[PDB]
Amino acid sequence: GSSGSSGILLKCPTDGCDYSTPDKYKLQAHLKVHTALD
Numbered sequence: 001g002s003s004g005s006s007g008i009l010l011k012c013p014t015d016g017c018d019y020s021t022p023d024k025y026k027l028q029a030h031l032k033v034h035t036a037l038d
């Protein structure tokens with residue numbers, strides 16, 4: 001399981017969402033912006 005580039009823009013999985021960041025952690029947090037409700 002090679003990686004090569006070892007770093008690419010992660011496009012949010014959420015359908016429609018156009019959020020992408022070179023950071024993995026940051027993304028994980030963003031994925032919460034959708035499933036976030038009081």
Ligand SMILES: [Zn+2]
Nearest residue numbers: 012014017019
């Ligand atoms: Zn998103």
